[PDB]
Amino acid sequence: TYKFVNMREPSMDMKSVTDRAAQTLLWTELVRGLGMTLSYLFREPATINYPFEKGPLSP
């Protein structure tokens, strides 16, 4: 049982062509990555205050 990861064909209609041209010229996916980093900026960090706080351990 297997699946393909890179076997998809782009749509060749005028709307899809114009959308791809807008992506190429206006950098939509780059803004998407910027949005991901901006979203992370507003989260609470995972850092603890060593040595005043310690990492969890087990018996």
């Binding site: 114009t18 959308d19 807008a22």
Partner: protein
């Protein structure tokens, strides 16, 4: 007579776990983006046209002041 206690899944089972890729669209169309860009360009062109014509008139006035003072 203690029964066996061991780390086991809860009766029934665990809740479903998502694993498939989740990448939404989250965007406009190309036509809309191009239309907004060209509209902004046209508005800017109009504003700068008026401002530069006014600036030309102001420069003419300054040059006339210089001409009146030259003799």
């Amino acid at each position: 007579a203690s029964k066996v206690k061991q780390d086991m899944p809860p009766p029934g089972g665990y809740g479903p776990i998502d694993y498939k890729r989740n990448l939404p669209r989250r965007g406009l169309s190309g036509y809309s983006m191009f239309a907004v860009g060209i509209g902004t360009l046209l508005f800017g062109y109009w504003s700068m046209m008026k401002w530069n014509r006014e600036r030309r008139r102001l420069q003419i006035e300054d040059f006339e002041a210089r001409i009146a003072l030259m003799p």
